[PDB]
């Protein structure tokens, strides 16, 4: 019930609407039941009598109520139609806004298919709470009232008695409805599960073929998919078993107020016409309460794809200071201060990491594999945050720092290259939207990208396909460099980001980019110790600790661990 | 105390008519139901012919229709069965069953029943 107060809640800006919708229902309602007792007022005032002179007047009244009663369906269909998709739409945008603002954390241990799946097809199943489904209980709230009223204006004495089934019908409606939120909810789950996996196989789907793995991923596939067909024919006749079940429960009433009409009729107190009319109207209200309480049963879906959209809609999301400062005049002061860091905050990554960087200084960054020179980068652009100590940007705190003027000074070139299915102007226009077409093509033709472009179908124009693979791994790091150093940040950082690039293209580089790379501070991470070593500053990382610091040629004299990693390249 | 006499029951030939008497003596308040039920050698209880004095609406048997004609006397305190065009096939026990409604009866406690003597009527 609590989960269907917050869903009710998306119907409040509707309210106006809905009050509408409720008003044509009725009436439409008072004509469906006006409707056959107009069919036998004409059987009785034209028929019986034979004078079929009233026959066109009765006629021309039947029609403008069933001409009524139409446009009145299509008027009611029409208006709830958009209000329905209004709300639909609203949770999709408050899905997706939700995610924006969610940490970065969440997408790696999350799989994606299941968020795809919270997005689509738990969203188009909080449409059976909408649309018809408000029409039907507001046609069947309607008629129930109209037929309680009718039953005690029949038989008050027998009204009690059709009165008293109801709580076994709400008891047996409270069973069923129970166990389908229960299968439904497990349903949603197992196809985020299954959407997870077509997600993730298919981008890969290449070294799955290159180790043969389809056999393989066929039936670890075929046991979630044997899942969903499991729990899903569980959720589908539990949505269904109500109705036939309630025909019972209604023949076990028409039996005792058969026996309790008899037993009144042999008191002296009604007739045996009564009990023949009480019959018909104990019918026009089972009709909508079986029909409310099937609709109860139906909403459940609803309900149980509606927790699964609240979940993602609850999620602790990145928030900036109160108190926040916006970064004006950006120089590049970068320090660390006995910085400490952890990922599963068990086994520590970075241990006590301080260092200062001057403006326009060019650091380089090197150490072994898994060393923690990305943690620091990603620490540095706020993806993540310090268990224990301080980042200082131009003298001001990471946390003081608001991450929208943070995110604006620092560019990054990341270890693993992700660009989009869009053209090749697009892709380098991200980060700086406000860039002319000159100033792309002048960038591209300074990291040697420009020669590869031109040569494509279309040029700047060529619509890549799904993260620019249709391009060398090399070709695609080229486009990442061009990016960001379109974005012009103050402070730059490139992480690995000529590790596909060819050391003869990487030294062409090299020497046009220090024009372009003077007068901005800048984080260089590679493993080609003889790129990096003109650096200002090489920080020499080694088991998450700054092991070695300093220029080139004093490391080397030093005969260090630089040295070891130095030597170690001939 | 209520008891209920049967008479008037002997062979009548096939076309004839044959007129059922039912005497009601006892403390009776008001009858509100009024039946005849016919029993074959080796059958438990059937029903034939029912008189509501609410309305005044006769209910007869499917194979009956337009031959018996169900009555009471109010002054007199006796039911009537009048048989006409009288069929072999109806040659069986009739007997009797009346309600009666007393002063004050409570909310859900009814009220009593009685039954009639039983009354052989052969027909061939």
């Known amino acids: 019930t609590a989960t269907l107060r917050r869903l009710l809640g998306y119907l409040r800006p509707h309210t106006f609407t809905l009050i509408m919708v409720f008003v044509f229902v009725t009436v439409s309602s008072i004509l469906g039941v006006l409707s056959p007792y107009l069919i036998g007022k004409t059987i009785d005032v034209v028929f019986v009598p034979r004078r079929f002179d009233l026959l066109p007047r009765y006629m021309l009244i039947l029609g403008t109520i069933y001409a009524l009663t139409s446009l009145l369906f299509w008027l009611q269909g029409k208006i709830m139609l958009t209000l329905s998709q209004d709300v639909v739409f609203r949770l999709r945008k408050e899905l997706f806004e939700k995610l924006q603002r969610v940490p970065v954390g969440f997408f790696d241990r999350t799989p994606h298919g299941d968020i795809i799946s919270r997005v689509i097809n738990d969203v188009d199943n909080i449409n059976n709470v909408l649309g018809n489904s408000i029409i039907q209980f507001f046609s069947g709230i309607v008629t129930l009232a109209g037929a309680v009223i009718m039953m005690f204006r029949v038989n008050v004495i027998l009204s009690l008695v059709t009165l008293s089934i109801v709580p076994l019908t709400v008891l047996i409606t409270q069973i069923v409805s129970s166990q389908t939120r229960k299968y439904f909810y497990e349903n949603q789950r197992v196809l985020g599960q299954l959407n997870g996996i077509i997600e993730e196989d298919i981008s890969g789907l290449t070294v799955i073929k290159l180790f043969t793995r389809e056999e393989k991923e066929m039936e670890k596939f075929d046991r979630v998919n044997e899942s969903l067909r499991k729990v899903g024919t569980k959720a589908q006749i539990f949505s269904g078993v109500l109705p036939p079940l309630m025909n019972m429960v209604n023949n076990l009433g028409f039996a005792l107020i058969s026996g309790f009409g008899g037993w009144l009729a042999l008191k002296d107190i009604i007739t045996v016409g009564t009990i023949a009319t009480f019959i018909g109207y104990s019918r026009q209200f089972t009709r909508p309460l079986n029909e409310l309480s099937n609709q109860f049963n139906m909403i459940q879906m609803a309900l149980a794809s509606a927790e699964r959209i609240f979940e993602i809609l609850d999620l602790e999301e990145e928030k900036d200071d109160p108190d926040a400062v916006e970064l004006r005049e950006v120089r590049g002061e970068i320090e660390f201060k006995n910085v400490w860091f952890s990922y599963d905050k068990k086994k520590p990554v970075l241990k006590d990491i301080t260092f200062h960087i001057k403006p326009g200084q060019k650091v380089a960054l090197v150490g072994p594999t898994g060393s923690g020179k990305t943690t620091i980068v990603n620490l540095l652009m706020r993806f993540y945050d310090v268990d224990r100590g301080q980042i200082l940007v131009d003298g001001i705190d990471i946390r003081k720092i608001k991450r929208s003027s943070l995110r604006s000074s620092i560019g990054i070139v990341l270890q693993d290259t992700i660009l989009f299915s869009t053209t090749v102007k697009e892709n380098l226009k991200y980060g700086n939207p406000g860039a002319t077409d000159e100033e792309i093509k002048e960038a591209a033709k300074l990291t040697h990208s420009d020669h590869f472009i031109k040569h494509l179908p279309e040029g700047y124009e060529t619509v890549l396909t799904d993260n620019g693979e249709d391009l060398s791994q090399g070709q695609r790091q080229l486009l990442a460099i061009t990016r960001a150093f379109l974005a012009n940040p103050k402070i730059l950082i490139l992480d690995a980001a000529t590790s596909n690039v060819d050391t003869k293209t990487e030294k062409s580089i090299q020497a046009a980019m220090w024009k372009l790379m003077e007068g901005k501070t800048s984080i260089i991470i590679a493993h080609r110790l003889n790129t990096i070593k003109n650096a200002d500053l090489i920080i020499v990382l080694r088991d998450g600790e700054i092991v070695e610091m300093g220029k080139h040629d004093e490391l080397i004299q030093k005969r260090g661990f630089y040295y070891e990693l130095f030597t170690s390249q001939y | 105390q209520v008891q209920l006499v049967e008479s008037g029951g002997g062979s009548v030939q096939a076309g004839g008519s044959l007129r059922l008497s039912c005497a009601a003596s006892?403390?009776?308040?008001?009858?509100?139901?009024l039946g005849w039920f016919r029993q074959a050698p080796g059958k438990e209880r059937e029903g034939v012919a029912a008189l509501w004095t609410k309305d005044g609406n006769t209910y007869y048997a499917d194979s009956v229709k337009g031959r018996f004609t169900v009555s009471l006397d109010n002054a007199k305190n006796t039911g009537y069965l009048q048989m006409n065009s009288l069929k072999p096939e109806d040659t069986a026990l009739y007997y009797c069953?009346?309600?009666?409604?007393?002063?004050?009866?409570?909310?859900?406690?009814?009220?009593?029943?009685?039954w009639g003597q039983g009354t052989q009527v052969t027909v061939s």
């Open positions: 069953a009346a309600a009666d409604t007393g002063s004050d009866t409570p909310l859900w406690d009814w009220v009593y029943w009685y």
């Open positions: 006892g403390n009776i308040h008001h009858i509100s139901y």
